[PDB]
Design an enzyme around this catalytic site. Structure first.
Site, mmCIF file in Angstrom:
data_model
loop_
_atom_site.group_PDB
_atom_site.id
_atom_site.type_symbol
_atom_site.label_atom_id
_atom_site.label_comp_id
_atom_site.label_asym_id
_atom_site.label_seq_id
_atom_site.Cartn_x
_atom_site.Cartn_y
_atom_site.Cartn_z
ATOM 1 N N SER A 196 -0.621 15.372 -12.315
ATOM 2 C CA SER A 196 -0.855 14.966 -13.690
ATOM 3 C C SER A 196 -1.101 16.211 -14.543
ATOM 4 O O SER A 196 -1.615 17.213 -14.054
ATOM 5 C CB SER A 196 -2.049 14.011 -13.750
ATOM 6 O OG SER A 196 -2.444 13.771 -15.088
ATOM 7 N N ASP A 246 0.820 -1.202 0.000
ATOM 8 C CA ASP A 246 0.000 0.000 0.000
ATOM 9 C C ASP A 246 0.857 1.257 0.000
ATOM 10 O O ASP A 246 1.358 1.662 1.050
ATOM 11 C CB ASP A 246 -0.889 -0.014 1.256
ATOM 12 C CG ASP A 246 -1.812 1.171 1.345
ATOM 13 O OD1 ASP A 246 -1.940 1.876 0.326
ATOM 14 O OD2 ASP A 246 -2.427 1.358 2.428
#
Length: 330
Positions: free
Chosen positions: A199, A35
């Site tokens: 992004s 994770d």
């Protein structure tokens, strides 16, 4: 040193991925959910409330000759999805794919929430976010990667998640045969303890690319792709019959649909998520309404590049003094 381990979807929908981990001496192998959105290595154990264990493999520290109770230490974690666990702490030897750390904090669960109990395939979590998020008290502990870093050939790990198929976590090296083209690196902020990046935009199907900054986290422990409502609406508008359902808890679509791809930007590079990756199947057994793999982050408070996005790429988690993230097509 290096390590290399196969990671395997837990079910036919890729709801999560498990990776075998050797703990203790002799080794006790547990299948952990790696994770990159948390920083605790915790396991089901011989200390876990019996009614809260249902099929998981447990760590029994008394059977490990290298286990030592970390005096006074406890942990308690609450995840973004409302799940939780807590317990006490041992140090022990932990190995992943041939890479060994001695003195690793292994957090033994005394209590776990229902969703952990109900998932028999996940024996615990191995956190790969920054150690600043580790919950051990009163002395915060280091992640597996943090403990291994100095010994690694290069201070990196890579995630190569499969679509309906196994993939790989590598530590200490970049497998140049595992991707196509080049790896594009992008800046990381560690200020919230996550692999947080920006992004450069998105496209829906064969549509034009929209240049726009989307801050979010690269999180192997989140199943879906959570993005701003504007972006998500633009995606689902291209699927006839798709709608946001408050009763179901997100966008659903007719199971008969062919889904468009979704592209996200990494600098000037582009990662394409095929439409099939966005199908999470019937909302309930037998239903012809299917759950979408792209969902709104509104009211999560953060955008999350979860497995849906990450599995379309070869992803480098570069833990150099100034961390960065790399993405390649594959």
């Amino acid at each position: 040193s290096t390590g290399s381990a196969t990671t395997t979807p837990i079910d036919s929908l890729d709801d999560a991925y498990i990776t075998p981990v050797q703990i203790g001496t002799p080794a006790q192998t547990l299948n952990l959910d790696f994770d990159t959105g948390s920083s605790d290595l915790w396991v089901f154990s011989s200390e876990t409330t019996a009614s809260e264990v249902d099929g998981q493999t447990i760590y029994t520290p008394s059977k490990s000759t290298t286990a030592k109770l970390l005096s006074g230490a406890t942990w308690s974690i609450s995840y973004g999805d409302g799940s939780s666990s807590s317990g006490d702490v041992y140090t022990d030897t932990v190995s992943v794919g041939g890479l060994t750390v001695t003195g690793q904090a292994v957090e033994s669960a005394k209590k776990v929430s229902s969703s952990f109990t109900e998932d028999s395939t996940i024996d615990g979590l191995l956190g790969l976010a920054f150690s600043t998020l580790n919950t051990v008290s009163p002395t915060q502990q280091k992640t597996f990667f943090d403990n291994a870093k100095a010994s690694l050939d290069s201070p990196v790990f890579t995630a190569d998640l499969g679509y309906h198929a196994p993939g790989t976590y590598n530590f200490g090296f970049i497998d140049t045969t595992a991707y196509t083209g080049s790896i594009t690196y992008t800046a990381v902020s560690t200020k919230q303890g996550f692999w947080e990046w920006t992004s450069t935009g998105y496209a829906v199907g064969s549509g034009t690319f929209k240049s726009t900054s989307i801050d979010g986290i690269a999180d192997t422990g989140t199943t879906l792709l959570y993005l701003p409502a504007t972006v998500v609406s633009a995606y689902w508008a291209q699927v006839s019959g798709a709608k946001s359902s408050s009763s179901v808890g997100g966008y659903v679509f007719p199971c008969s649909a062919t889904l468009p791809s979704f592209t996200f930007g990494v600098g000037s590079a582009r990662i394409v998520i095929p439409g099939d990756y966005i199908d999470f199947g019937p909302i309930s057994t037998g239903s012809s309404s299917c759950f979408g793999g792209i969902q709104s982050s509104a009211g999560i408070g953060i955008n999350i590049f979860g497995d849906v996005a990450l599995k379309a790429a070869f992803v480098v988690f570069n833990g150099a003094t100034t961390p960065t993230l790399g993405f390649a097509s594959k």
